[PDB]
A paper describes a structure:
The homodimeric cysteine protease Mpro specifically cleaves polypeptides with glutamine in the P1 position. Mpro of SARS-CoV-2 plays a vital role in the replication and pathogenesis of virus. Additionally, its high conservation within the Coronaviridae family makes it an attractive therapeutic target for developing broad-spectrum agents.
The compound with a 4-methoxyindole (20a or TPG-20a) as a P3-capping group was a highly effective Mpro inhibitor, with an IC50 value of 0.0278 μM. The asymmetric unit has a single monomer, which forms a dimer as a known biologically active form along the crystallographic 2-fold axis. The Mpro-20a complex is stabilized by covalent and noncovalent interactions with the residues at the substrate binding pocket (S1’, S1, S2, and S3). The crystal structure reveals that the catalytic C145 nucleophilically attacked the α-carbon of the warhead in 20a, forming a covalent bond of 1.88 Å. Interestingly, in the case of 20a, the electron density for the second Cl atom is not observed in our 1.6 Å structure. The residues of the oxyanion hole, i.e., the amide backbone of G143 and the amide backbone of S144, interact with the carbonyl group of the halo acetyl moiety by a hydrogen bond to help position the compound. The S1 pocket is occupied by the six-membered lactam unit of 20a, which mimics the Glu residue. Here, the lactam’s NH forms an H-bond with the Oε1 side chain of E166 and the main chain of F140, and its C­(O) interacts with Nε2 of H163. The isobutyl group of the P2 L-leucine occupies the S2 subsite and interacts with H41 and M165 by hydrophobic interaction (bond length greater than 3.5 Å).
Numbering used by the authors:
A (entry chain A), B (entry chain A): 1 to 44, 50 to 301
Amino acid sequence: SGFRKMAFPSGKVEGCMVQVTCGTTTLNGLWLDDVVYCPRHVICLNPNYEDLLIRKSNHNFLVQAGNVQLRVIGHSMQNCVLKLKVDTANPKTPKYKFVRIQPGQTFSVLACYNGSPSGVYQCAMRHNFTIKGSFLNGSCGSVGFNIDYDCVSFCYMHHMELPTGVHAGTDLEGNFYGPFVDRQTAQAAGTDTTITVNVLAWLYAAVINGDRWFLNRFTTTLNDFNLVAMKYNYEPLTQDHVDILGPLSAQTGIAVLDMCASLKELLQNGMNGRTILGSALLEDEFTPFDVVRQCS
Amino acid sequence: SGFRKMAFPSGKVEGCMVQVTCGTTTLNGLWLDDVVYCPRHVICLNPNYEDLLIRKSNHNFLVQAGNVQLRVIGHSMQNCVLKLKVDTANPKTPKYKFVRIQPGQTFSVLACYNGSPSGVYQCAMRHNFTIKGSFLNGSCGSVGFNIDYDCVSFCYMHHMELPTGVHAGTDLEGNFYGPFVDRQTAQAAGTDTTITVNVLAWLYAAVINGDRWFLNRFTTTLNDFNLVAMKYNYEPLTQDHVDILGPLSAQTGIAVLDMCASLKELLQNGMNGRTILGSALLEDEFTPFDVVRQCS
């Protein structure tokens, strides 16, 4: 029993983190086989990165894995990421993939500074392609990931903090999530919504853990729910979402549209001083998979 | 910017986790140098553990580190923990200490099953010596820890889930936190309180991150605050707590007793629909050290 924001064990990723210094700028890089991946900002209001890279030499890049220095033998740019070819393959390279994630999906972040891991936490990709992280100066190049069996699926490399204090970055091919750029500029994200399917998954987690006070005998229709959903800035619920919640509905014996009637009531009336899984708010950063993984 | 429940990177602990099987019972163990530490329950309503251990042989203990089997060459009991001497020193043994923590202090938990890490999260030791964890059957032997520099301070080994769904365990010398025993019985914890000094630390984290709506021009006395604190089941605030919050008070320019007047107002009036660091409740599982570590 119990339900926590739970990150993946970070050890496989810790063994890949290095420090990359170019001139006066230091940030983090990801060392997989004989390539180090890092934000291209390490070579700097609006840079001409192609010009800046042509003017670099391999010896300008100082790459340190712990104490050991790795020598750069080649460099190339891929969108907003640099690929530094090094003379040594990382012996701790796990099985891995570069996967781009969808809004509403979660991942673990290993916050890293000067190439040294600092902490681990869970994030969700918001529908406006930001994440609500915890990052200080020098965190550029920290990565987000999921683990399946022994395989690390890297999905995020950190680049930017927005004026609102949320964070923006790229996938590991260097393509930004959302309408952001890697420049020293103030950038605004689009409007965000609440991830409805995750709220429902978390209500199922609560029932599995013994929180039932919000249940009711009523069932609603998908469309009557969405009418109420649009009013409170919730993502419209779809049949595929209903299908994805099937396993949790089966385990608890509570049909999805039955749970939707509970959510509608919570949106209209609040919690009236009560809490769900220790929260006084409706939590939307647990996916259905996250609940099944942790509750089973 | 941003403030998250942040665990320590778990890699140093992952390399120490093994599986211990005795008869039909399997749980997790902690492999440091040539000793495996695990809950003594692995040898089982009220066992006579001294009798049960005398009847065991080294060859009854199946210890597996990944695929590799470790052979037990000796065994002894230390309070509620077994020490299994093995023929191989763990080559990944980090610098480490066994430290017992105080109520109100936090640590990271690496939830482990069949010797394999599953996830990482932060916990606080409550004043009733329970933790609000996330643990399923087979999680016995999972450990909690803090990291300072390169040194792992192990503080918790998991044994028990209470009927209320909170968790109980021992330090790594096998001595339980709180009035609990390692038996298949329903056990109740004492009454709990809210960790006042941590709530204040978290209010400082909020100010550092730009949440100021709860501030006010008023200052209170320590005793007038505690009169209100006792009414809402908060731990009495002491001068040492005030001293510990000094660095955060200095960074924000908000005196501790000034912040106490804000907390008193929040206790009496609530938040009136607003949130602090994404929460609609007063959060008490961040220590002053946790805030400084993450905000700096």
